Ligand binder design. Structure first.
Ligand code: MG
Ligand code: ZN
Ligand code: ZN
Lengths: 729, 71, 157, 95, 593, 315
DNA sequence: ACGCCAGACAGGG
RNA sequence: GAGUCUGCGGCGCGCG
DNA sequence: CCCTGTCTGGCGTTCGCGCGCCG
């Protein structure tokens, strides 16, 4: 039950703090019994989100709780419901138990109300998990807010009403994986809880009582309140999150500033201005490109890398320990016994790497020297040493190196020596050495980004601002999303955010559309109408009218059915803009793209790059002690699994040797992999497979049991798997 | 690396933030089907719109000559 | 150097248990802390299973590959790597017999079906708890002639 | 895709046999010296860092290019198992 | 040859294109086709960007008729209510009738929306994607422009109130919650089907892995006849099986015997191409052929393996199957993928000989049928003036055979699913096999999957690679042993060594799982069932695992008995005219003195 | 019997059960030699008998546990040989390749079914031994050990090494795998075209064979070592040669969702407005009038006009 | 918790 | 003329 | 003593990859 706090981004941690699991003591619910439990039962209303549950085998069983849901006295998730005696609604609320809720006739919040009076004779209400059209006279209780129906996590989706629940889920879960960008911007379109999340979560630092500001350090903000007191508020400069993300508090208050009680003094890891912010608001064209956005691929404008727009600081904490071997203590020094000084520059402090030093894959982070053999020296290594220089340090290089993949700059270092202050050093552990490395993760092709609705995908190509889709005015788009990924999935919500986002771009305003009660299609068309004066209005005054391009697309457009034939291009373009679509030129050819294409400000986040991302390619390396199959860990990537599902795939094909190869030379054939390597170094023809150790290990396992497994020849006679170690003496 | 502890920064070398062109119909006495190209260029200040335009036309001309020696 | 064309599971003869066997583990002595070395004859002794080290021996009379297939005159250590230690088998000589659970608790009791006994309950009855048998001849009575194969108790015995 | 795979497929009785052939031919191409080919002169294998593929890039890429010609001979039992490796070392130099 | 195989008379759909690839594959050659693919790939992609197709909120267009059909159906709902408030309709009737009102009204809005796009917006972004093989689903479109109307409760009983909204307009607070229940069961369902889809691929492989093509045209000509017509959709009316289905049965097959149809002479052993199977259908149309004699794995002679003439065409390539192709797996796989889309529970009941939920009493006797009227239990009797096979048909069972006509052995005397064991007893094995096959295809068909019968046959064969003994020779009577191993016994006991000790056996039907559990080698058995049991027995009896089959021979890390390890091609030498002469010079030197 | 941390030692649970048996057999030997009171002899032979089960198979009858720490059945020999992740299953599925790799996939539009974009950085490790030798064939490195050290650090790679790799992969191909390997096309062979970065470029048309879209799916990569394995891998396992599916004789290289949208759009015919007569089929005044009426606003370029709408008359 | 197969024993002639 | 030894079982979560 | 029926006894339950923790 207790696990690592998922603090990818504060919202994540907050979510991992309140979610409800089924599996546990074992007394409650087991794992192969679940179809009944997994479903979203009727009573889960306002008590459990129907959306927050995970996709996968453990479905419907592990889930975070709802909005106002609160455990009362004994584990019964209750929920708020306002009272309504007669046709009058109160501002009074009763957190009701799941059982008590059944006894009453509760109504929805959407019910037209003039204050305390219901306003429509036949208004909706739900008796007991049964939708029922009740009269204002029977309305005993009313819902607090549509919010309560879902969790915090989901409440963050702009037009959740227009998104299929199955994808909404993926949208909720995605927020929990958002990574803190140096530049945090709040969505151009919000739900209403972004403020609350950063506040109830402990991201930003708020002002206790009213006062003025004294000092504004990059490290501390000591305010002076009006009651005659003054406090110094340190700020977690740069701290290592569990998940390796940056947690910095950036002061937003200037020196000598009268602050209101409960005002942001500093912004949390991912807040803009007290608002929750993960990933950034980018202009986006929703059209297809060559094949760069095929099934779920995304095209990124190099321009986004120019201004550090998707950049993330990452901290990986490599660590090494000076163990005490009965062969001689493992020393930690600048001495790397065998080959170069060029690899010992960065290692400036004797042993430790210097701070602010660029560490690339394969560089020494920390040096260490242990002893060469198990117990004895070497007869063949004794001659080599003596030939060029007998007096060769017998100590072996076992130094903490940068594991393949990446390192960055060394920012902090920690060393616990002999006379420990108040630390717990494990036995054998002479001393420890932590090395904190940080690195800016500019957005690259490997990375994956996704919007709050569910559209997930990876970056296929970083196009030069030179030729990607550009608007009538020089402003080019940042990302180009593939339309095809919207029909199949059902999330028009994204198409709605982009429209509203379009208006905000030329109207210069951010918005807040509640969950079920937010903005409406008519209201957005209205704002876009305002946007048209911003966009085309300055165009008229600046000195120019419509393009041949702009007119051509219009023809094709009216022939399509997007503009009422017979109106003036000025009036026509407006009608087309209101549609949420504008004219765009290719950027490569300068010719327009036949047919209006929508564009807008869609909030998109970058996802956490696990060590799963940082690709694993393995040539040769470690092997397991009992099973002789390939394995890695620290620096040697580790072999991929070939699975029977895949064996069959090759079985199907006439791939005989390719399969033999997988089962012998590449994984288990001890003598084979060896001869294999050597042969390839030579440019020779690999030898022919010797028996695999798994078989050998199996026969004996089977021999451990009374059973006798003997291999046989043409005529049923012996043959020998174990080359000669089984005969006795 | 001027100083060993200095930190490099990302390079942004385009003196132009955005370019825009429109092709509106223009009248020449005899035939009405004609093009008029007006391109608006914005610059950070380092260089001027005119200076940029000229350099631009030059890079295009320099590339048009690369069609000289067949093979 | 031949190709393995047929594999075959067969029951093990006690003599065969000994034949594949190298040494007998006769004491519960894993490894004595002071020296991470195998304690006594125990479960990890190297005679019974194999060279704790590379090509080298015990004491060190012969230490390389030139004499790979010969044993030390004073100490018996033939050596390849420590693999000879991971392929060899050891046997334990039990006092009074016990049976394979694989053969006695499989749905159809291979011994229960073969031996006409209560397929599943008579077995469990005398295997784990208390009931005794007469092998060749026992001229005197219980009340009836000697039981050639039947079983008697300690009290009437 | 690859050069005349259809042609290739058509020259054998069974798909998986062609594979055996091409593989066993690339082997011999390396082993007894890489000059053991049947069509080097005018048009032949080529790579472009230089035109150097003429010496040792891919083995079977050649085997294929040869088998696509009617020079080689692949049978179930064409030439007695051991006498082939003897006469092949006798006549082909490169080591 | 490019205009010979293309249709420029219609917009290029995924199917028109699908068919252009296939044609191009057969006509011009493999690699040349690959060229065509990339070509389409390149232009499809380019034209795509330029086309400017994009989803817009307004692009999803709501029919003006939605308002009507909803109101029309709304008022009708009141009529159903007023009709119950009087006491005319039973509590149930009310419900079932209301469902039917929406079930139809929703489908009504469906065709309506499309009708709008078809007549007024042919080039609608959302629409065109759906029409083009691109992206979209008729049911999905509806949820955006039309309305997603009925979402069932937790249990399964659909809700009485529909979801009057579309995704275009605000799906309300509750309609969302209501619809949530279904999404959750869907996600739980998908999770348990994925596990069971991989398991089915494991079991199919456990029994068909050994099946590999290693042959010479097996000479035992006992073939299967691919029916082209189906019996009861409507009681009794003969009909031409679906184009799809029939194609699935005769495409790329090898005729067992010569058939003269509409004028052409389809020779024996000829592999009928898709065009040929188009011919036979057109002929059945005219009325010249009711069946089709065709070789099939169901009747191969090769004990362990299947030959070229029996399997057929389909290698990954369109020509006959190359000897040395792992068919067992290839079959096991083609069945295990589509499964994840299914439903599946039946497919399991089918591969595993079982007694399904709704059993149907099969007529063990073939005579005619007759029914009775007494109170409690009804009764369907297959009778003769000699005897009747009493078939107890309780209250809930719906019998469709009537008082009067004939009923062959193993014929449905009750309605629903059937028990393989009984059907085996009544109508025989040649009937079980064909039952299983068709009854399995029934599910994938109904789900869009199009898999060739070849595969389900390969598998089902193995379900019956075993039989019981009733007249001994070598070993005692009651025994379940390998069918072909008896064909061996009986063959040499009558042919080579005299004394006709007929080995009378009984066809035994077993499920994929039990055939794998209980097979010859143990290595294979040690893999799934109970390693514990499998080994026990295999030990007792010193069992020599003769390595044949890919499962057992993979464990050893030895070469695959199938593939290149194919004894057919494991040995093949290559020559240069230069070494051909040199070896001949070696023969010439053989002349002594 | 291994050294874990600080002094912690881990030994396979089999030993705890072996101790059990040894101890009991011994104590029994001693209990029979000392003096034998029936009750105590049986009481032990029982425990003895149970012990013997323990190593063979634990759980058939009761389940032995390591003392208060983990109520876990000590993995008995049967357990080691059986199940999903057991010993018989480790053999059959042989699970871990030496020359393997895996990364996130990303669409490679220009790529031809024939090839796949593989990260050079990934290649370097993948084809390392093949590269080492090639280093020596050239002047970049004196010997293998040399060539290895040359590559143990990322800032030490001369641009010449990439030339060498690019050269070593010339005509060799690699296999690609997808999350669930459902059919034979679950794995396909392609020609690696070295590319920059993390992601692996995959061809769009094959995206149908392996159930794979680009929201983050990751595909594994292996390398055929033998000249035999490579042969088969590029002859009968490459992508471009396995176009039809083993299930149905229908293609699997069918244009996907993106391709078809494009190829459709281009081939469709449009229809617009018929208010005035649509009969050019017969009158010659119908050609004139409906051709001038089109020039006007009345007849569209695509009118329901049987034989030819004015759109055909004009051009 | 479940589902399924195979099993050994006990009740009614 | 380099090669040893460690990373297991399970648990939790997340992607596909 | 036979055949039939009922509880009874033993086994099984996608695949791959990340990360992190623990004796
Ligand atoms: Mg995906
Ligand atoms: Zn010695
Ligand atoms: Zn056959």
């Amino acid at each position: 039950l207790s696990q690592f706090k998922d603090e990818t981004n504060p919202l994540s941690s907050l979510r991992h703090k309140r979610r409800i699991s089924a599996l546990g003591p074992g007394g409650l619910t087991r794992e192969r019994a679940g179809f009944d439990v997994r479903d979203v039962h009727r009573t889960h209303y306002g008590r459990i989100c129907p959306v927050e549950t995970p996709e996968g085998a453990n479905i419907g069983l592990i889930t975070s709780l709802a909005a106002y849901a609160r455990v009362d006295e004994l584990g019964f998730i209750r929920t708020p419901y306002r009272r309504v005696v007669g046709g009058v609604v109160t501002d009074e609320v009763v957190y009701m138990t799941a059982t008590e809720e059944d006894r009453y006739t509760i109504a929805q919040a959407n019910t037209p109300l003039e204050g305390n009076r219901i306003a429509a004779e036949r208004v909706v209400a739900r008796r007991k998990g049964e939708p029922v059209i009740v009269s204002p006279e029977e309305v005993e209780f009313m819902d607090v807010s549509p919010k309560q129906v879902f969790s915090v996590n989901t409440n963050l989706i702009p037009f959740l009403e227009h998104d299929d629940a199955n994808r909404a889920l993926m949208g909720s879960n995605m927020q929990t994986q958002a990574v803190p960008l140096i530049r945090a911007q709040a969505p151009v379109v919000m739900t209403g809880l972004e403020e609350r999340v950063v506040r109830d979560s402990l991201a930003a630092l708020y002002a206790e009582e009213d006062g003025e500001v004294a000092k504004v350090d990059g490290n501390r903000i000591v305010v002076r309140y009006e009651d005659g007191r003054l406090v110094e508020y340190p700020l977690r400069r740069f701290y290592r999150s569990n998940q390796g993300t940056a947690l910095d508090q950036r002061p937003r208050v200037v020196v000598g500033q009268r602050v209101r009680k409960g005002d942001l003094l500093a912004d949390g890891p991912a807040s803009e201005n007290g608002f929750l912010a993960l990933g950034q608001n980018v202009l986006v064209a929703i059209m297809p490109f060559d094949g760069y956005n095929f099934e779920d691929a995304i095209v990124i404008s190099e321009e986004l890398l120019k201004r550090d727009f998707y950049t993330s600081i990452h901290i990986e904490r490599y660590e090494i320990e000076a163990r005490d071997t009965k062969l001689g203590p493992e020393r930690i020094t600048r001495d790397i016994p065998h080959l170069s000084e060029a690899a010992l520059r960065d290692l400036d402090e004797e042993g430790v790497v210097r701070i602010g030093a660029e560490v690339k894959p394969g560089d020494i982070l920390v040096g260490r020297t242990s002893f060469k053999g198990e117990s004895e020296p070497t007869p063949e290594e004794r001659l080599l040493r003596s030939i060029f220089g007998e007096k060769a340090r017998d100590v072996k290089d076992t130094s903490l190196r940068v594991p393949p993949g990446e390192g960055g700059i060394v920012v902090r270092t920690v060393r616990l020596r002999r006379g420990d202050p108040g630390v717990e050093l494990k036995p054998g552990v002479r001393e420890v050495v932590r090395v904190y490395v940080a690195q800016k993760r500019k957005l690259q092709v490997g990375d994956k980004l996704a919007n709050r609705h569910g559209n997930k995908g990876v970056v296929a190509k970083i196009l030069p601002v030179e030729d990607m889709p550009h608007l009538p005015d020089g402003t080019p788009v940042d990302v180009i999303l593939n339309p095809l990924g919207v029909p199949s999935r059902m999330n028009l919500g994204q198409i709605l955010e982009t429209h509203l986002g379009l208006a905000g771009y030329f109207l210069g305003q951010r918005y807040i559309s509640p969950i079920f009660d937010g903005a409406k299609e008519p209201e957005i068309k209205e704002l876009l109408a305002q946007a048209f004066e911003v966009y085309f209005g300055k165009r008229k005054g600046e000195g120019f009218g419509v393009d041949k391009r702009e007119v051509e697309v219009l023809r094709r457009a009216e022939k399509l059915g997007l503009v009422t034939p017979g109106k003036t291009p000025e009036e026509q373009l407006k009608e087309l803009f209101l549609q949420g679509k504008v004219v765009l030129y290719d950027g490569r050819t300068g010719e327009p793209i036949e047919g209006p294409i929508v564009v807008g400000q869609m909030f998109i986040m970058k996802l956490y790059h696990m060590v799963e991302d940082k690709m694993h390619a393995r040539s040769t390396g470690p092997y397991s002690l009992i099973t002789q199959q390939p394995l890695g860990g620290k620096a040697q990537f580790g072999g991929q699994r070939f699975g029977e599902m895949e064996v069959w795939a090759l079985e199907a094909y006439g791939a005989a040797h390719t399969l033999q190869e997988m089962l012998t030379l590449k994984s288990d054939d001890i003598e084979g992999r060896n001869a294999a390597y050597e042969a390839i170094i030579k440019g020779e023809d690999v030898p022919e497979p010797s028996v695999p150790e798994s078989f050998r290990v199996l026969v004996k396992e089977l021999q451990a049991l009374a059973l006798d497994v003997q291999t046989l020849d043409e005529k049923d006679n012996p043959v020998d798997i174990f080359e000669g170690l089984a005969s006795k003496r | 690396k001027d100083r060993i502890n200095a930190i490099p920064v990302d390079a942004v070398f385009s003196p132009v933030r955005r370019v825009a062109f429109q092709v509106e119909d223009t009248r020449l006495g005899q035939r009405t089907d004609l093009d008029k190209l007006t391109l608006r260029i914005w610059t950070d200040g380092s260089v001027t719109p005119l200076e940029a335009l000229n350099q631009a036309v030059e890079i295009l001309r320099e590339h048009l000559t690369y069609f000289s020696n067949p093979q | 150097k031949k190709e393995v064309r047929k594999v075959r599971i067969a029951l093990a003869s006690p003599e065969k248990i000994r034949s594949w066997s190298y040494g007998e583990v006769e004491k519960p002595e894993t490894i004595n802390y002071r020296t991470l070395k195998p304690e006594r004859d125990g479960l990890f002794d190297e005679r019974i299973f194999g060279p704790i080290k590379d090509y080298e021996c015990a004491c060190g009379k012969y230490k390389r590959q030139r004499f790979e297939g010969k044993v030390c005159e004073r100490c018996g250590v033939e050596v390849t790597k420590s693999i000879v230690r991971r392929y060899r088998m050891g046997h334990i000589e039990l006092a009074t017999p016990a049976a394979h659970i694989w053969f006695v608790k499989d749905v159809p009791s291979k011994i229960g079906t073969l031996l006409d006994l209560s397929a599943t309950e008579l077995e469990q009855v005398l295997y784990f708890s208390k009931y005794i048998v007469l092998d060749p001849k026992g001229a005197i009575l219980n009340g009836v002639p000697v039981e050639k194969r039947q079983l008697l108790t300690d009290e009437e015995y | 895709a690859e050069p005349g795979i259809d042609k290739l497929f058509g020259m054998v009785d069974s798909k998986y046999r062609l594979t055996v052939v091409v593989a066993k031919r690339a082997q011999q191409l390396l082993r007894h010296g890489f000059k053991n080919t049947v069509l080097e002169p005018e048009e032949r294998p080529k790579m472009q860092t230089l035109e150097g593929l003429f010496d040792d890039p891919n083995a079977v890429t050649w085997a294929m290019k040869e088998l696509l010609t009617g020079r080689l001979v692949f049978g179930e039992n064409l030439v007695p198992e051991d006498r082939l490796q003897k006469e092949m070392e006798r006549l082909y130099p490169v080591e | 040859v490019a205009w010979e195989l293309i249709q420029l008379d219609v917009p290029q759909e995924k199917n028109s294109l699908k068919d252009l690839v296939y044609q191009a594959f057969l006509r011009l050659g493999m690699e040349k086709t690959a060229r065509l693919l990339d070509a389409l790939k390149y232009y499809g992609f380019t034209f795509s960007t330029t086309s400017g197709i994009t989803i817009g909120i307004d692009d999803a267009v709501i029919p003006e008729e939605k308002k009507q059909y909803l109101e029309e159906a709304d008022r009708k709902l009141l009529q159903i209510e007023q009709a119950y408030e009087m006491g005319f309709l039973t509590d149930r009737e009310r419900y079932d009738q209301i469902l039917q009102l929406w079930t139809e009204t929703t489908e009504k809005v469906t065709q309506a929306v499309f009708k709008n796009f078809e007549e007024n917006y042919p080039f609608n972004p959302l629409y065109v994607m759906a029409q083009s093989g691109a992206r979209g689903n008729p049911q999905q479109i509806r949820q955006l422009c039309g309305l997603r109307g009925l979402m069932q409760k937790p249990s399964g009983e659909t809700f009485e109130v529909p979801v009057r909204s579309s995704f275009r307009e605000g799906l309300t607070v509750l309609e969302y919650f209501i619809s949530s229940h279904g999404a959750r069961k869907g996600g739980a369902d998908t999770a348990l089907r994925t596990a069971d889809s991989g398991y089915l691929t494991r079991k199919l492989v456990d029994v068909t892995h050994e099946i590999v093509v290693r042959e010479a045209d097996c000479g035992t000509t006992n073939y299967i006849s691919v029916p082209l017509f189906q019996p009861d959709e409507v009681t009794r009316s003969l009909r031409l099986r679906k184009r799809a289905d029939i194609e699935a049965g005769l495409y790329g097959r090898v005729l067992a015997r010569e058939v003269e149809v509409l004028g052409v002479r389809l020779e024996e052993g000829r592999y009928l191409s898709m065009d040929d199977v188009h011919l036979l259908i057109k002929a059945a149309e005219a009325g010249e052929i009711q069946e089709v004699p065709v070789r099939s794995p169901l009747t191969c002679q090769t004990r362990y393996g299947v030959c070229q003439k029996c399997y057929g065409y389909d290698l990954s390539m369109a020509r006959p199957v190359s000897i040395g192709e792992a068919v067992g797996i290839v079959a096991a796989q083609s069945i295990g993928e589509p499964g994840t889309q299914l439903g599946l529970p039946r497919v399991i009941e089918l591969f595993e000989a079982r007694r399904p939920k709704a059993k149907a009493v099969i007529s063990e006797i073939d005579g005619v049928v007759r029914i009775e009227e007494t109170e409690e239990k009804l009764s369907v009797f297959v009778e003769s003036e000699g005897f009747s096979k009493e078939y107890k048909l309780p209250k809930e069972a719906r019998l469709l055979v009537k008082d009067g006509d004939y009923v062959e052995a193993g014929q449905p005397l009750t309605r629903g699913a059937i028990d393989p064991h009984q059907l085996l007893e009544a109508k025989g094995p040649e009937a079980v096999e064909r039952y299983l096959v068709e009854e399995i295809q029934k599910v994938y068909r109904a789900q869009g999957v199009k898999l060739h019968d070849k595969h389900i046959e390969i598998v089902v064969r193995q379900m019956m690679k075993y039989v019981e003994v009733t007249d001994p020779g070598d070993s005692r009577l009651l025994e379940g042993q390998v069918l072909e191993k008896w064909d061996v016994e009986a063959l040499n006991e009558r042919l080579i060594a005299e004394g006709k000790t007929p080995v009378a056996w009984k066809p035994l039907l077993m499920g994929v799982t039990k055939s794998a559990l209980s097979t010859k080698s143990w290595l294979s058995a040690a893999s799934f069932q109970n390693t514990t049991h499998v080994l026990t027995e295999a030990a007792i009896a010193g069992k020599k695992d003769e390595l044949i089959g890919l499962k057992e021979n993979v464990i050893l890390g030895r070469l695959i008995p199938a593939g290149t390890g194919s004894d057919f091609v494991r040995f093949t030498q290559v020559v240069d005219q230069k070494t051909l002469k040199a070896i001949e010079e070696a023969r010439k030197e053989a002349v002594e003195a | 019997m291994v050294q874990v941390d600080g002094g912690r030692f881990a030994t396979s649970d089999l030993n705890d059960l072996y101790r059990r048996l040894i101890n009991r057999n011994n104590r029994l030997k001693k209990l029979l030699a000392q003096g034998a009171p029936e009750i105590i002899i049986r009481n032990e032979k029982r425990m003895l008998q149970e012990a013997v089960d323990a190593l063979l198979d634990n759980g058939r009858r009761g389940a032995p546990v390591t003392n208060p720490g983990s109520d876990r059945p000590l993995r008995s020999l049967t357990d080691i040989l059986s199940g999903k992740q057991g010993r018989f299953r480790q053999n059959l599925l042989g699970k871990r390749v030496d020359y393997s790799g895996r990364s996130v996939i990303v669409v490679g539009p220009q790529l031809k079914l024939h090839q796949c974009g593989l990260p050079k950085r990934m290649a370097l490790e993948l084809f390392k031994p093949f590269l080492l030798k090639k280093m020596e064939e050239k002047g970049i490195a004196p010997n293998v050990k040399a060539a290895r050290r040359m590559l143990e650090r990322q800032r030490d790679i001369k641009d010449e090494v990439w030339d060498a790799l690019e050269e070593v992969i010339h005509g060799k191909v690699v296999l690609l795998n997808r999350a669930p390997t459902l059919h034979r096309l679950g794995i396909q062979a392609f020609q690696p075209v070295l590319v920059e970065g993390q992601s692996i470029q995959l061809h769009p048309l094959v995206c149908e064979a392996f159930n794979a879209d680009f929201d983050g799916d990751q595909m594994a990569v292996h390398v055929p070592l033998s000249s035999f394995a490579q042969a088969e891998a590029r002859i009968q396992m490459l992508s471009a040669h396995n176009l039809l599916s083993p299930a149905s004789g229908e293609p699997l290289a069918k244009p996907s969702r993106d391709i078809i949208l494009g190829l459709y759009y281009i081939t469709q015919v449009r229809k617009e407005k018929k208010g005035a007569g649509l009969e050019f089929a017969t009158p010659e005044e119908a050609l004139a009038a409906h051709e001038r009426g089109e020039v006007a606003l009345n007849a569209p370029i695509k009118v329901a006009g049987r034989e030819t709408s004015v759109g055909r008359l004009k051009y």
